[model samples]
Target chain A: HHMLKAEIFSGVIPALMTPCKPDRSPDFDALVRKGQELIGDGMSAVVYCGSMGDWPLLTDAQRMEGVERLVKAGIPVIVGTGAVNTASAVAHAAHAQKVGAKGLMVIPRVLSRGSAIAAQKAYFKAILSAAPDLPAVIYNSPYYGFATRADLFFDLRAEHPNLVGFKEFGGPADMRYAAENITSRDDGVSLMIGVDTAVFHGFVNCGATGAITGIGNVLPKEVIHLCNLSQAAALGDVDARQRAQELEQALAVLSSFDEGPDLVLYFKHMMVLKGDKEYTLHFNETDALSESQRGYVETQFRLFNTWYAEWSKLPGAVQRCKA
Target chain B: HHMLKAEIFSGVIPALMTPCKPDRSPDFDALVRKGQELIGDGMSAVVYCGSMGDWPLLTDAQRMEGVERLVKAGIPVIVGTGAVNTASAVAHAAHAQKVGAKGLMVIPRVLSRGSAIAAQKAYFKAILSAAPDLPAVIYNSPYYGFATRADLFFDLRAEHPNLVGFKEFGGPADMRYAAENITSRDDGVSLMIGVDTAVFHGFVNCGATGAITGIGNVLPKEVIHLCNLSQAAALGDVDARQRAQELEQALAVLSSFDEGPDLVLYFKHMMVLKGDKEYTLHFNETDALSESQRGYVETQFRLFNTWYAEWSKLPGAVQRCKA
Candidate 1:
């Protein structure tokens, strides 16, 4: 009965990154396989070509290819369809709908000086209207220099039955605003915490339905387990407490490594460190990681493995949650 | 008596285009002169670097220069401060405030896909906070691929005293919504119609205060006259109707020519035809207007002059409006 399924919205969704070949072209086949792997890792949904996915670096055609390939491979995805203009944004939305995205992470127009109310409305209106059958969640972030206020979101939602969620990229006050004002009732809107590090707090405290976790790209298992614990913890399961803390500790290690400008910078490195060498040592017009940057990620990656190895041996840390 | 003066917002505020030199670089001195000319033509304000102003084509530094120059010339101006990134956008707003712009036409982030709610809130929050002393209006245009809802505009207005107006770019219903919802009373938020042709109806029926007219760049006197008549017609002034209709007819001539991506294209041409050849014959990487296209503008320009000449000779068409 959910527009964005409650079970999925209440679970973990990874903000998946694009896989580039040596030439730095988006490897869609690789992306499809990567998406399948995340689904196997217990992600209820995946965010394709979001900020974590290096959306700004790739063309709309390439982004559409990634979404299409991944969907064809059976990955439930919330495709990012933000573009630099309204026409292209509508095209992205239409493409996502054509290819069968489970939900849409629609970014408002970027690179415009006219984020005029009419343009903004027309931007979303065209996208939502283009894909009238798909549930779309707005990707509200400070990085793009705009946010959807709860009251305004509801106004859009009133017109668009497909407008089903809000991907909040703010702190507790923002989370609380949307949690209380936007999704307080069964109005069918999902408030997914976009900041991975704060995802736990958003779920446990602010009543978030799900998280589009950038950190989930590397720490999918821990994040998925955290979502399970989070769901159980919200229902007052006292036994979920210790396990949640253990997962939080593991997440914190990676979250700290996933600091400023490092999400995409270190993502491939971290993936390579985790033995997914298929990510290819691509430079993406930026320099190849410095010997120093390389060593740092190496150390951080090992620290995580070492922590998870020991942490998993803890009594009941590996215990299953009441999902 | 006005956060955004009723006298200003209800009048013509041209979406002034940038004048560039042989190198396609902005001509700041010419911009100042243009602003002064519009002001002398009875414009209460001007929108600097909006879509019509070639915002995407200019650098932040250049735009700031235009704003600084125009403001220094003592032209009442609302500087357009939307950027591809938040830092730059904040920088633009900061500069506009430092330079003493009367108001800010803050365009939301224009080259972004991370239009995450957090980013969006942060984007405006930084700009508004940076220029706390200036009244800011959101330029809501469909061209930017996003719009601020009445509900959201009010939310921002509630938080930022500087969030004083909305430049609505939609049709009748959009105008009525904001006229009734966003600026229902003296809450300091003025709803100025953003579309030029629809400007008259917005003022007459929807209670619009002012207009940021793209056509105003070419037909400032006509549009300014239309705004005066519109303001009068709103007050049940009977004689204003015939006057308004006559001006509307003059405007429709220029407006019909101003259609379909010709705002910036024909603006300079129309300006040249109007004898302000200071608008440098530069094309921003686009081909020079083709012979046929040039011929079209020539005919349109002459017809407009012929119509205005005839319309002005009407018994009282040249009669000054009551203040």
Candidate 2:
């Protein structure tokens, strides 16, 4: 069996945080370098300007520049085109498509008042229609005041053939519902678990086809290995399933922080821990961790390094492509 | 087994919404009426000024008055003493204790800047010590930029015996971590699954002691029944577990809305549909839903009513005392 265009959007996709200069302006060089580093670290693709991409905080011009820069640098990207208005979202989608992004990720924009399904559907449809040829994923980011339900996703895909996937930033149960109902169909959408914590559970048990994760930005190779093991287990590799569970249980300590309200800082700090000098976090949240927390993160990484050094020696452990 | 001050905080508790007068000011009379209605509907306790409780906007004086009114009306309450300042939270905690609150739910207030565990731990300890005699639960509300970790919970309990519970507003995994790590200890604190969505999974499978749920405010009797069945299941009742699963799967449709960012509006509208004229929503989110969305809620409730009528007739199904 061979894969086609939209199918390439599957597997471990990092929702890359834009590494910034000290002044917090966009650093195109660092963004491209990080994108290349991610792909080099065994991630097949990266999502640009996702919740981690500094979003509306990035001016419209800055977002356009970032996407253009990444795609031009030959890094595969699924550009997040979410905006504060449908018109702006449509413009961003058009720009992403024009710049030859591999896919589009759209979040609902009209949620300032309430999550009226009609408004959200209209928003999605407007953005998707603007870039009819490219593969697109509906981002079900609940923190943004609305989620794109499977019922809604199914309804939307009837018109937008390019809408091939859903990135669920929800729990295993939410992913489970999407799996049993949405992915079970004859012409199904690929369910990408969108949270770091849900990735293992979703891929192994909840019928998730891929993950667009923030933690992947910190530890891409490990995330990819876990993703492969989970997919293998999903496809009936019992040994792989057992190993996936064991590995994920160990990784949960690091991944659990993704559920923290201040994950952007953690992601940046996590990168910094791995010796990426360009990964200074410019988040609005606390700029620095307490000494204890910094020590905790350092110890967590060290423990992982020590454990994995031996974990990789196990007979059934996943042997991934090089970083 | 002698029950003392704080053991009463266990079981299903509803974090109540303030049913406001149209002018959008404090509706003390309506607040008391709702409080009584909640207890009359079979909730063992209520959490005042929670995320659902129209906090911060309600003013320091308004918060104090509401807690006083609810306590005077003889409703069991766990006052949400979360505030912008540490002293304010301490004061609110003291007021709750003075007014005979059964418990206090303290969310980390120093989160606007970021979550430094030291600052959060200090904030929590300050509030807990203010009402050292009353039982209190740490509110792990992650949306506010911090979640009280299981490590932190266990660490705090050493110094404060009254820190009897932890309300986890997180996923099954998060609740699972608390269960395995914190609640598994011999001197474990009560592990209350604080989200409406995680209640069934946490209670039946993840060793949660209780739930502080918003959906309880909409479907109080049903939530309470589910809670009872889940606890029974945890104690090794097979039939109760099966029934709990089916009941929760059905309730998932309604409770899933609680995961939506606009749950306040849904909660208010849901209460209104159940024949409470005083349940006008005073939310900063959307003031209303589209006709289609309104009809959707109506149908969800209708479907629930029809299914539950037959569901209640099951030979081994839970039969709860009701409104």
Candidate 3:
């Protein structure tokens, strides 16, 4: 089976965050511990140096360091290597591939003079031309960066054969379109749900392969259970349906807060409570959260901890990949 | 007659470049002389602190100081009062009016989330609300700020009747649309042609009452003459048509530099040759024109000066504005 199929079939992956020492250098030992911890908890892969991990704040060297740290822990790793300028993005992407990153997520920075399909294709062409060996997945976002349109994807896939996946973070209509239009051909790019709440139905109904979510950071067991229940082909089992319904209700609330730069903040706060406080932070942002904001984050951690404990006992909820 | 229409129908006004010492101190004497020179040459009005002047670079104190310097010169002054935030724009606009500016120009700093009408109108409304007596014109440039689509203007007109005119800087299509949609009604806002090449024909063909230009810093007489030919009583005269065509062609060629921060450098070098060399340019841009670029600019100036001499003997070309 292909790496893409293997990843999709693994059920759930909490996009892992990069841990840093107080001085802000990568905490490689702690990073490996977290990587082991997540994989042991049934994570299929690790998304390293993503926006949540503060990809923009770190130098290209640091990103490479983080990816190397994660990949060495024997887990599949997808590196976030997008940038506004074409040359930098191209160089960064090629470097990611050289370091054994399994896939690359591309964001169109300063996408250009017009939002036309030609402009988008120009952006993708620049990326794929540099790292033709790695599978390129697009991060289609609305509130951030240059691109907001998804129709551009139609031409994107046709023009760049290496564009093998899409992560929809723009809106629901785009999510639906991405899930519906992607094909099952040998060369077809996989459609992945990027919305936190919508990922459930997106996978079941919209023909999506799986979900990639930040909320999965706080609720990996629950996300894994949903994917496992869907994969089990055992809807007739009452316990699985009850487990899926319970997780869905809990996650619907989580998805509501999934729309901002704060989603990463929220995810890290949960990890801080369940694991390490030092890892919960504003990765790239210079501004620290206010005292009130800190209190609010602490509140969220308490709530998530309750949910995490409750969900751990359900069917397919236990981690199966513990080393 | 509305103050806006009165200003537009009467004459050609040039947006002034702020004269600043390299340390960013306002050049009071050079500014006074430049103001005097423009008035001596029969400029319809003088606008300072507009985008062409790089208004955003000034501190509030510097902007206030600049406004005062112009106020002391005794010309009918129009001041630019655009900022990224609404409340701040309104405050500066009110202060400009209080310092005796004859008119104020406003532009939207944000237009993506809400309608441009709401964003622009809120800006204009804040300015007008602060100083109801000050005549105001909307600076419609999608290039600098967000593009306000056509539907937004009708919506804006309904909200901001006090918006006495519009400076058409969007494009030829916007100029054409404004001419068709808005004209000299007692309640309607006046339309002013923006950009040099289009200024003459745009005013004539698109019902534009006057023109606003950055290039006028170098060629004020040409702008005035073009305005004269445009607002002609009869069908277009051959001389006037020819002049407009030549001016448009000249501007088209001049405006075709590579896009980015270098645009300001190019425009400034031309201004210095037009006689502001000792006038203290506060080019505080994070990026500076490289030596080769400065050489290219120097060469372009020689070509432009040659063109200017030829242009002066044309039907409408006049000498530079003098105190």
Candidate 4:
């Protein structure tokens, strides 16, 4: 089968932030290096051109080239093929398949006239038809002006069988709906929490299979370990949940900034402080952190690193459950 | 000076909805014909490629071609050049100027990392730099994920001389802010109400010079008449205020449907019902309305026409004020 097995999608998948030059153009070489670096650190899969990747900011040529380079890194990769129009999105999906992408993560017709359920379904229909055999994860980020409800996802899945998972984000209602409606059903469809703030509750309590986390861009190793610990908790391991809470508490220091505006800048700021020099520049919104905000993030990231060091030494912290 | 005089942008500038073929592609011939028809019917100016124009759905080539055609109709034209990134938006703005666009109606870096005030200005800076001579109106619609507050608009105006107007469209607070801060300032800048629901209050009570309306697509004559009466009311004509209220009451029926979702379809449906047969199709998000909703729109439109017929017979209703 040309489609990725449903098993391959479940677990820690980091959506890569596109590294850019000072002019905010894509730095293709740096992006390829980063993709390989994350794969070596054990991300189950990688997604390109996601919200963190500044998909909307990139030109079509840039997107296609970035995807081509990432696919050659020898890791399972999903390309974000969302666009405002169906024809454009269909073209993007077909290109991802042509370049041997393992799957697609699509954001539905955002900023359309209105939230017409039929139009939303038709958008996915056209995209999936372009790459029929590629297993896909539908992105539901309400912040981006469209969120796929569990009901809508189920309806679309029946119509397009290759839709095997959801990258659910936004409010508690969406997370709760997917947890009660899809993830707990054990129907082979996976749910990956897209929001960093809810990743813990999504996995430990809500039965999410994994996470497609933006926070992974800043602390790849800690995020990967959290994914493993969450999985161990899923297997009824008591200590796993305990260690998970400790990690989450430490991670909260960074995630709390996400609750405010300018999250991309904050994340990029953290990355620069962690010795990743490439992120010193950000896309269009390049206002730097204020002295106080920078001080807080610096202190919190230091504490998070200390916690990660201790956690890596724990039993089973670095191990992933066999798929 | 290449920048348009501020007076040119004031009053009854209908944002022309792009007419589409059955396949949802741009019907350029219909768009050109409609532009001429609206110009003949006494619209003070025209805006192309706005939210009503489905700016996000159109390809760049389509946008440039549409603007080129509209410029031939001999009316002041403002193109919506808003894009997801600075470079793309700058390119669109430069092309709009190249094709003889008089002004730009820009939607800022919407769906960005956050509502950073500085980031918003930087977005406008890049676009204005691309076409230094074109006057521009900044759009602030929270539904599109960016709301330009009165403070931000004023701050930006200080930096960019071409920033001459604001398309204020949010809550009462936003309108109130623009009314008091911008229009009242009388510094050669105008506030054009972008929300149809607030048109009457904006022009009559607030100090707004005009509106960029979607309902204008279906009822150009009535919308133009409303703009005149509202201006009359502002000029201390006590009877004009009462007459303006009467016209606003009639407009309420047509504007009521806008409150519901699928607004583009609802507007197109009304246009078709109003004897514009070519508006028979709509673009993305095509869900049929319920029978009751259709019945409501039809009844309201019928009543609106009856009122419009009577209003046009009133003294000076058919005459536009010479700016």
What lDDT is reached at residue B254 by model 2? 86
Q: Estimate, for each residue in B124-210, the C-alpha lDDT of model 2 and write its tens digit.
A: 888889999888888775555567767788788889888888778878887887777766565646788888888668887777777
For TM-score, candidate 2 versus 4, the one ahead is: 4
lDDT by residue (A1-323, candidate 4, tens digit) is 23333765777787888877877778988988888888788777888877777777777778888888888867688888867667678888999889899888877776664366667777888888788778888877666545677777878878888888877777667787877876566567777878777777888778787788778878877877677777788788887777776777778768666555667678888879878888888766445677887888888888878867766675653444322
How many residue pairs clash in each candidate at the backbone level? 43, 1, 5, 0
Error of 2 at B15 (Å): 28
lDDT per model, in order?
Answer: 0.72, 0.76, 0.62, 0.76
Candidate 2: which stretches are off by over 4 Å? Answer: A1-5, A144-147, A281-286, A320-323, B1-323
- Model 2 TM: 0.53
The candidate 4 chain B region of ten consecutive residues with least summed lDDT is: B314-323
Docking quality (DockQ) of candidate 4? 0.53
Which candidate's DockQ is highest?
Answer: 4
User: What class would a CAPRI assessor give candidate 3's docking?
Assistant: incorrect
TM-score of 1: 0.54
Displacement of residue B261 (Cα, Å) in model 1 is 19
- Predicted complexes: DockQ each: 0.06, 0.03, 0.05, 0.53
Output the number of the TM-score-best candidate. 4
Name the docking class for model 2.
incorrect
- Encode model 4's per-residue lDDT on B69-175: one tens digit a residue: 88876667898886766767888899888878888887777556446666777777778777778888888766655567667777777778888888777766788
Weakest ten-residue segment in model 1 chain A by summed lDDT: A110-119
Residue-level lDDT tens digits of model 1 in A143-202: 544567876787788898888888787666878877878776665677888786666677
The Cα error of candidate 2 at residue B296, in Å, is: 16
